[PDB]
Structure 1
């Protein structure tokens, strides 16, 4: 039930690619952008844009590692269902009162 609801939010976010990304992420526990682009075949710019969307929806978190050859960070993402129930609800309420204002036209 939370399995499918997560994936449905992913579809709204980014279609079949988002659903591939979420599924590979859950199967792997944690993953980098690059690891997810290779697991899935989706491009890394799009894996990344999906992940930052899941992060803004507070459905994903990450933890950062400093790559010491270059000094730049790279993220290890993971799905965070902790607040998924409140997210599912908020999205319903919001969609409902988007309808409410069309009725108040």
Structure 2
């Protein structure tokens, strides 16, 4: 599960912890992950949005009926996880191709 090697490049130990706990749980809210990990709830959100732009996490949106506002259930995005992996392999090869051109 080379997923952790990427998350680490975005936001270090905290990001690796968030993915591992999300991986352990399957799905989690922003607040649920903050309690599990001890990271400020504000920081988990930047992670998740960072992970979302890195295409390693997606979500489905549920509407909280008490407040009328939405909250997200995060998940690791395995639909694009293999594509993200595949791009990383391709980027490394392209780095090698430039060397053969040295």
- Which segment drifts farther, 88-97 or 16-25? 88-97
Aligned to 1:13: 10
2:32, 2:80 → 1: CA distance?
25
> Which secondary structure state, in structure 2, belongs to the residue aligned with residue 5 of structure 1?
coil
1:54, 1:35 → 2: CA distance?
17
1:46, 1:101 → 2: CA distance?
38
Structure 1 residue 33 corresponds to structure 2 residue 42: no
2:101, 2:41 → 1: CA distance?
43
| 5+ residue gaps, structure 2 | none
CA displacement at 1:26 relative to structure 2: 0.9
Report Cα offsets for 1:75-102 as digits up to 9, x if no partner.
1101122322221221343456568779
- Which segment drifts farther, 9-18 or 84-93? 84-93
| 5+ residue gaps, structure 1 | none
Aligned length: 102
- Which segment drifts farther, 90-99 or 56-65? 90-99
The structure-2 alpha-carbon separation of the partners of 1:104 and 1:43, relative to structure 1 and needing over 3 Å to count, comes to farther
1:95, 1:46 → 2: CA distance?
30
CA displacement at 1:25 relative to structure 2: 0.5
